[PDB]
Structure formats: C-alpha cells, structure tokens
C-alpha cells in the first residue's frame, strides 16, 4: 500500500498475460 494503487489506470493490465492471449486466440 505504497504508491501502488495511488495511480490506478490499467486497462492493458498484465501485459505478460495480454500477450498470453493476444494472438493465441487467433
């Protein structure tokens, strides 16, 4: 509960999982 959650704007959250079903769905 430092700066974590102080600036919370994440629509592309978990990029190393957004990859995991970026083109896998394709």
């Amino acid at each position: 509960q430092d700066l974590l959650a102080l600036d919370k704007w994440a629509s592309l959250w978990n990029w190393f999982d957004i990859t995991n079903w970026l083109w896998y769905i394709k």
């Epitope: 974590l4 978990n14 990029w15």
Partner: antibody, heavy 130, light 106 residues
Framework: EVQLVESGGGLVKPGGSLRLSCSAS????????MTWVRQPPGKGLEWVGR??????????DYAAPVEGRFTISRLNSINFLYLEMNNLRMEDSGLYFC??????????????????????WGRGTLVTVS | YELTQETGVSVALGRTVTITCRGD??????ASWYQKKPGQAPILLFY???NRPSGVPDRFSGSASGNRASLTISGAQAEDDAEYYC????????????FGGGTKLT
C-alpha cells in the same frame, strides 16, 4: 531528451554488497518499465533483469547467473530505478547499464511474450570487485 | 550463448555486406540488434524483427534470415563500423530477454 544518469558502485571485496541508482527524466516513468544489463570489461553486454510495468504485475525477472543475487526496485515518485546487488562473486563487474525497456508485439508473427527493445540508455557507471 | 553470435567481420569502406547471429528462440520470437561503439552509449539498430527506430543510420539495411538474424550495412563508414550486438528471448515463452553478445564489424 530522456537523460538517464546512472551513478553508483565502486571497489568492494569479493563478498559484499552495494547499491546502484538510475535516475530518469524526460518521459513517463510511471508505466514504462526499465531494465538493467551488465557488460563485464572483457566481454559484451549481458542481460541482468527488468522491472515489469506498474499494472503489468510490478514484478521482476532476474537472469540465469544473477538469479538469487540482485534485486530491482523503482520509486516512481522520484523517477528512480534502484538495483541492490548483494552476495557478490568475482565475475560481477563492468559498466552496468540502465535502459528503458519497451513493449513490442504484432499479429501475424505473434508469440508471447513477444520481444522488447532498449532504446534510451544511460551513460554508464563502472563497478569493479576485488 | 543461447543466442549464439559471430566474433566479427571486416569492411571495405563502401560495402553492402551482412552480419549474422544465430539462436533458435528467435524463430519463435522477434529479433533485436544494437550498435555499441566502445566508450559510448549503445544504440538500437532494429526495433522488432521487421522495424527500425528513428535516428538509425540510413545506410543500414537488412532484417533477418530466420533464427540467424542477419542484417546488412551499406556505405561503410570507418568511424561507424565499431561493433554491433544481438539479443532476443532465451527460451520460447520466457521473459528472460538474454543479451546474446555481439560482432566486431571491424
């Protein structure tokens, strides 16, 4: 103009520890995530580690020799990338570089996690163990 | 290395010639290639397998030959020749973007 002034480290016994800092100003530190790499003097660049994006996990992934040795942290309030390097061996040395990693991906040739690139680096900071 | 490389090549001051760098993981992922004159800040010659970042030398060319990432340098400038480096993921699916060392353009 993304100045990356990294300044820290010096002489130390084979066993020890030290604390390198990598400032940064002129871009968005708050989400773009950064990497460290090591270039031992009689060697080329070798990859060390990289903080993950705030909101992209905020975690770190060490390297094959470095795993269990180093630790990476970022204080985004002051735009500072700290690297604690502890439990030192003798091969640990060189002009340790801090650069701003990027996220690159595309369809067609897509494959997780894709690839990243090191665009704006720092000047350098020598560290040598004895 | 896992991203195995070449020790180096030579120059002719006006040549359009290629330099290469092997490593299977690149057949699954993209490619990264850099320029690092000693004593200076390294630069990025190619951002991604098929793309190059701004400010790169215009003479520079070539993209990739598979897991043997190869690219061509044209109009060989003596000061520019320096040395160049290679990188990509070490295992397919991993996040460890190993730096696979480099080549003495010489």
């Amino acid at each position: 103009e993304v100045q990356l002034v990294e300044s820290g480290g010096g002489l130390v016994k084979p066993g020890g520890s030290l604390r390198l800092s990598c400032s940064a100003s002129g871009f968005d530190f708050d989400n773009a995530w950064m990497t460290w790499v090591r270039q031992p003097p009689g060697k080329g660049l070798e990859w060390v580690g990289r903080i993950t994006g705030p909101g992209e996990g905020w975690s770190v992934d060490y390297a094959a020799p470095v795993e269990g040795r180093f630790t990476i942290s970022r204080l985004n309030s002051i735009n500072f990338l700290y690297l604690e390097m502890n439990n030192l061996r003798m091969e640990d040395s060189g002009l340790y570089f801090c650069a701003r990693t990027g996220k690159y991906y595309d369809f067609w040739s897509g494959y997780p996690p894709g690839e990243e690139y090191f665009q704006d680096w720092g000047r350098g900071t020598l560290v040598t163990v004895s | 290395y896992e991203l195995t490389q070449e020790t180096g090549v030579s120059v002719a001051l006006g040549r359009t010639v290629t330099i290469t760098c092997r490593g299977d993981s690149l057949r699954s992922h993209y490619a990264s290639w850099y320029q690092k004159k000693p004593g200076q800040a390294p630069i990025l010659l190619f951002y991604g397998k098929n793309n190059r970042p701004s400010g790169v030398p215009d003479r520079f060319s070539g993209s990739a030959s598979g897991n043997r990432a190869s690219l061509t340098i044209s109009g060989a400038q003596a000061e520019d020749d320096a040395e160049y480096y290679c990188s990509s993921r070490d295992k397919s699916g991993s996040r460890l973007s190993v730096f696979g060392g480099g080549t003495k353009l010489t």
